[PDB]
Amino acid sequence: KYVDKIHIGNYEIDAWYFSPFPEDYGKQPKLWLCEYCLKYMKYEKSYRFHLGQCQWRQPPGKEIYRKSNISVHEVDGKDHKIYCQNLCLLAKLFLDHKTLYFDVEPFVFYILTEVDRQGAHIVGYFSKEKESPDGNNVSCIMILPPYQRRGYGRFLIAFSYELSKLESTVGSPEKPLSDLGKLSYRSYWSSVLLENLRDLSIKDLSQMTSITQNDIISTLQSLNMVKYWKGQHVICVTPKLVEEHLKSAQYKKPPITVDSVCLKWAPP
Ligand SMILES: Cc1cc(OC(C)C)cc(C(=O)NNS(=O)(=O)c2ccccc2)c1F
Ligand code: NA
Ligand SMILES: [Zn+2]
Numbered sequence: 001k002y003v004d005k006i007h008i009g010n011y012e013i014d015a016w017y018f019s020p021f022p023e024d025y026g027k028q029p030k031l032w033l034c035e036y037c038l039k040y041m042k043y044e045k046s047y048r049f050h051l052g053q054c055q056w057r058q059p060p061g062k063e064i065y066r067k068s069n070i071s072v073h074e075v076d077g078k079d080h081k082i083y084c085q086n087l088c089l090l091a092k093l094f095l096d097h098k099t100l101y102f103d104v105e106p107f108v109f110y111i112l113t114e115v116d117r118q119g120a121h122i123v124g125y126f127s128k129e130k131e132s133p134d135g136n137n138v139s140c141i142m143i144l145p146p147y148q149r150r151g152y153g154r155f156l157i158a159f160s161y162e163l164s165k166l167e168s169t170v171g172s173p174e175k176p177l178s179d180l181g182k183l184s185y186r187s188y189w190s191s192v193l194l195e196n197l198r199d200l201s202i203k204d205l206s207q208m209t210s211i212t213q214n215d216i217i218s219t220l221q222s223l224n225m226v227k228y229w230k231g232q233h234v235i236c237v238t239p240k241l242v243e244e245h246l247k248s249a250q251y252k253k254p255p256i257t258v259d260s261v262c263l264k265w266a267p268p
Contacts, residue, residue, distance in 0.1 A: 137171025
């Protein structure tokens with residue numbers, strides 16, 4: 001019997017996938033998690049006692065982004081191993097393809113929180129390899145179900161590229177993406193490339209956005225905005241076509257933006 005439901009913060013969330021919590025935790029009807037330190041617990045009564053004792057009110061590590069009540073904390077897997085392991089176990093409940101939960105030292109984790117008077121409330125996160133041979137600027141990216149489709153995943157995607165820009169490098173999320181992750185990346189890539197084309201080669205779009213040329217190309221292909229000439233993909237779009245796409249329906253929700261002025265981060 002697996003964990004099939006969690007209590008975290010004020011949320012109850014059904015699981016989507018197996019996550020390898022220890023077997024005596026899986027047998028319970030519900031797993032209870034501290035939303036701040038991510039300790040997982042077996043019983044409502046151990047949970048209630050923890051909440052009265054636990055002094056964390058935000059993620060560990062350093063706050064590398066803060067604008068109003070939106071916060072990102074950078075957590076080195078080697079300096080906060082238990083926390084990062086608990087995060088990985090939580091994420092695996094909602095990610096089919098994640099496979100790494102306990103060997104977190106090679107990773108840095110970026111925790112998105114929404115802040116009120118009580119504390120910084122976890123919304124989702126992405127992990128990133130400290131050293132990525134493959135040029136992945138995201139390893140796993142997860143938004144908790146009650147926050148999905150509300151602009152938070154777009155924020156974290158945009159955030160992963162802002163770090164890539166600061167590293168003077170392109171990057172791409174590690175494959176395979178979850179289904180919602182796929183739709184989300186395609187929509188983010190469209191928005192960013194279309195906005196840059198409104199206001200340029202494929203290589204220019206790549207250097208301006210840190211989106212890889214392959215991701216740019218496959219995005220422009222889905223928009224039917226690339227020609228092929230003698231073995232080369234070549235952008236082929238009119239300003240009017242760009243605006244037709246941009247004011248269409250799916251680009252209408254106002255984003256949580258990443259304000260680079262509020263990003264406190266130096267490339268390793
Ligand atoms: C990357 C990602 C992962 C995710 O978790 C899954 C893995 C369980 C959820 C989201 C998410 O919530 N997307 N919706 S969105 O933020 O409103 C958004 C609107 C427009 C363009 C991009 C995103 C997400 F982006
Ligand atoms: Na649910
Ligand atoms: Zn706690």
